[PDB]
Design a binder for this molecule. Structure first.
Ligand SMILES: *[C@@H]1O[C@H](CO)[C@@H](O[C@@H]2O[C@H](CO)[C@@H](O)[C@H](O)[C@H]2NC(C)=O)[C@H](O)[C@H]1NC(C)=O
Ligand SMILES: *[C@@H]1O[C@H](CO)[C@@H](O[C@@H]2O[C@H](CO)[C@@H](O)[C@H](O)[C@H]2NC(C)=O)[C@H](O)[C@H]1NC(C)=O
Ligand SMILES: *[C@@H]1O[C@H](CO)[C@@H](O[C@@H]2O[C@H](CO)[C@@H](O)[C@H](O)[C@H]2NC(C)=O)[C@H](O)[C@H]1NC(C)=O
Ligand SMILES: *[C@@H]1O[C@H](CO)[C@@H](O)[C@H](O)[C@H]1NC(C)=O
Ligand SMILES: *[C@@H]1O[C@H](CO)[C@@H](O)[C@H](O)[C@H]1NC(C)=O
Ligand SMILES: [Cl-]
Ligand SMILES: [Zn+2]
Lengths: 13, 596
């Protein structure tokens, strides 16, 4: 999952 | 040009590129989640590479413009967000290594399967093979098999990977001048320089533990009642002074006790407030469920779903041909693109979840007009709370009667009330000790307070001491039982599910006052109250342009977590449990275990 976050751009699906 | 004029020019450039690139990446991610194929994995991996590189470079550029010379607070906020180094502090080799560890852990969990000891040609996965065992089996031995096989086959694989994961994450966090990775995670609640609305990272631990104290008595009584009814369902297997066995809690870990309702319902004669049978008898499908959720959100004044939602969403399992990631998710891709992915079943759980995810979507639509980095929930718990208050109203028997899942000739009484509150408690209240204990174990491990040779020791001690749950089989340090849960082995912070639960009741109290609700809070449904909808929207449209403390105070008039609304919600059930437990023991001994 992609995210509008500089600190956490990508979450493991 | 002034520093701020340059900053404005830069931010407009960054926002345009970010929108286009984020839309592209989310399209690839959607393809992979809807269609699990090697090609789709490739595309998503490359999209992620591009996304992270883009953010590294833009953050580097945004470093130029000093914050002290910026007077526009919207601009200042975007800059503040874009200036965080994050995981970029690690070396290319070390960052690559950590990425590979996270990817490996995810793949292990998703492909993990266990095979029957005899006839080991047919195997079971977590989703769905082992999950249905843990949810429905009434056989102590079959459940114990699924619980122990899953934690041994899969947990032991993740144990060394988790060990290195701790080291590398701690290195990144300390490089960003955080005490440890747990501190880095707690950063989500931090607020600085907002004149009395500030919130420090240490403050969250104190707040969580202080509220958990007040939670403890209600949980103790719920626990004693559950223990009693579990003895009726697993005779000879449960002590009346002991912890509960970990495989008999209704799912793979006891994260929710929802599935225990059928063994714990206090008044079986009264009509079922679990409307699964009503939905099936009335031939509901996922279309019906989601249209009902849409109707709910319209009744409070909110927009109904876009045409793109009904065209692009995935509301049912595609079939055996193409696998999908069936974790219910609400997608906000940008460019007016909103979707939901849910492999929807005709159950109450999915009816409430549909309401929850559509709540996520309504939050996203409300803050769409904000700048890119501000199109977010106020904190990690705000989105979950927003979905949970929707399900709070949806679960009420009054609401179920209004949509026809209870008969028109249905009457509330104190017994049906007790049933409703108990079923609510099984999910909501049951998850609190579990969530606090898991996150506390992680926090201590990251802090270095639990040596490796004691990890599974300490964890299970905490499980007995705080959750009141005991392992059926002794577990040495070859195991990694925490990593056997998706969120732990996929690097998700977990304390949000605690903070969500408090926020939700505060929101609900406030909204019900907006709806002029008369009665106990647990009888409140906000349907048809455009006033409550307006009140919630005023906060939803904010995005995260204001710190979470102020955003909370705008709806509930409080700057912090408050536990009182939760207790008021469950007060009648608390009383009934205290009376029902008058002959039972309340509490538990850490020393009783099934094996010894
Ligand atoms: C999901 O992935 C599969 C690949 O495994 C795609 O299937 C191919 O689709 C193309 C057209 O897009 C066909 O020409 C091929 O014959 C298909 N191959 C197989 C093995 O099925 C599929 O298109 C992807 N998308 C969806 C929605 O299924
Ligand atoms: C910060 O700068 C933004 C521009 O990025 C300003 O936004 C404009 O504000 C005026 C005032 O309502 C509007 O008429 C414009 O249409 C807005 N345009 C854009 C492109 O955003 C904002 O007002 C500034 N904030 C402060 C406090 O001065
Ligand atoms: C929200 O308002 C609608 C319309 O007033 C309600 O639907 C009506 O419910 C009454 C009884 O409450 C029925 O006699 C009508 O036939 C219903 N109207 C329609 C168009 O079906 C709905 O029940 C209200 N929601 C709640 C929770 O009371
Ligand atoms: C990010 O790191 C660079 C170099 O280490 C430093 O100059 C900058 O101040 C850092 N930014 C923050 C927000 O810590
Ligand atoms: C969506 O809501 C509108 C009002 O906002 C309502 O008139 C309409 O019936 C709904 N959509 C459809 C397809 O009817
Ligand atoms: Cl466990
Ligand atoms: Zn959620």
């Amino acid at each position: 999952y992609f995210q509008r976050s500089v600190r956490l751009p990508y979450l493991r699906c | 040009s002034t520093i701020e004029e340059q900053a404005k020019t830069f931010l407009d450039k960054f926002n345009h590129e970010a929108e286009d690139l984020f839309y592209q990446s989310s399209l690839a991610s959607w393809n992979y989640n809807t269609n699990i194929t090697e090609e789709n994995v490739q595309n998503m991996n490359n999209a992620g590479d591009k996304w992270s590189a883009f953010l590294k470079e833009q953050s580097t550029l945004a470093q130029m413009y000093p914050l002290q010379e910026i007077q526009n607070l919207t601009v200042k906020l975007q800059l503040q967000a874009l200036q965080q180094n994050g995981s970029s502090v690690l070396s290319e080799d070390k960052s690559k290594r950590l990425n590979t560890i996270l990817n490996t852990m995810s793949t292990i969990y998703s492909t993990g399967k266990v095979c029957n000891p005899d006839n080991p040609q047919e195997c079971l996965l977590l989703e769905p093979g082992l999950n249905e065992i843990m949810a429905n089996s009434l056989d102590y031995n079959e459940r114990l098999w699924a619980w122990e096989s899953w934690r041994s086959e899969v947990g032991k694989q993740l144990r060394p990977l988790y060990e290195e994961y701790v080291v590398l994450k701690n290195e990144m966090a300390r490089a960003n001048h955080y005490e440890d990775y747990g501190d880095y995670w707690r950063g989500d609640y931090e607020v600085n320089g907002v004149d009395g609305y500030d919130y420090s990272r240490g403050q969250l631990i104190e707040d969580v533990e202080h509220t958990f104290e007040e939670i403890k008595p209600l949980y103790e009584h719920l626990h004693a009642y559950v223990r009693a009814k579990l003895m009726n369902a697993y005779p000879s297997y449960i002590s009346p002074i002991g912890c509960l066995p970990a495989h008999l809690l209704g799912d793979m870990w006891g994260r929710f006790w929802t599935n225990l309702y059928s063994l714990t319902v206090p008044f079986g004669q009264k009509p079922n407030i679990d409307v699964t049978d009503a939905m099936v008898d009335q031939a509901w499908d996922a279309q019906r469920i989601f249209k009902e959720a849409e109707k709910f959100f319209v009744s409070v004044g909110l927009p109904n779903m876009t045409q793109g939602f009904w065209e692009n969403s995935m509301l049912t399992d595609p079939g055996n041909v193409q696998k999908a990631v069936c974790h219910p998710t609400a997608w906000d891709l940008g460019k007016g693109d909103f979707r939901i992915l849910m492999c929807t079943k005709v159950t109450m759980d999915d009816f409430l979840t549909a309401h929850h995810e559509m709540g996520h979507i309504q939050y996203d639509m409300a803050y769409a007009a904000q700048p890119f980095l501000l199109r977010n929930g106020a904190n990690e718990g705000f989105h979950e709370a927003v979905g949970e208050i929707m399900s709070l109203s949806a679960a009420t028997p009054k609401h179920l009667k209004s949509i026809g899942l209870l008969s028109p000739d249905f009457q509330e009484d104190n017994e049906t009330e007790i049933n409703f509150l108990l079923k609510q408690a099984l999910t909501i209240v049951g998850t609190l000790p579990f969530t606090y204990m898991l996150e506390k174990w992680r926090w201590m491990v990251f802090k270095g307070e639990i040596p490796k040779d004691q990890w599974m020791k300490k964890w299970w001690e905490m499980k007995r001491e705080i959750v009141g749950v005991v392992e059926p089989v002794p577990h040495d340090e070859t195991y990694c039982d925490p990593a056997s849960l998706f969120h732990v082995s996929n690097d998700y912070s977990f304390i949000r599910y605690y903070t969500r639960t408090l926020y939700q009741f505060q929101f609900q109290e406030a909204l019900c006052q907006a709806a002029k609700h008369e009665g106990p809070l647990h009888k409140c449904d906000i349907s048809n109250s455009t006033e409550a909808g307006q009140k919630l929207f005023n906060m939803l449209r904010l995005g995260k342009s204001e710190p979470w403390t102020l955003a909370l105070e705008n709806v509930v008039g409080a700057k912090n977590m408050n536990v009182r609304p939760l207790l008021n919600y469950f007060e009648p059930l608390f009383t009934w449990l205290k009376d029902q437990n008058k002959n039972s023991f309340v509490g538990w001994s850490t020393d009783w275990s099934p094996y010894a």
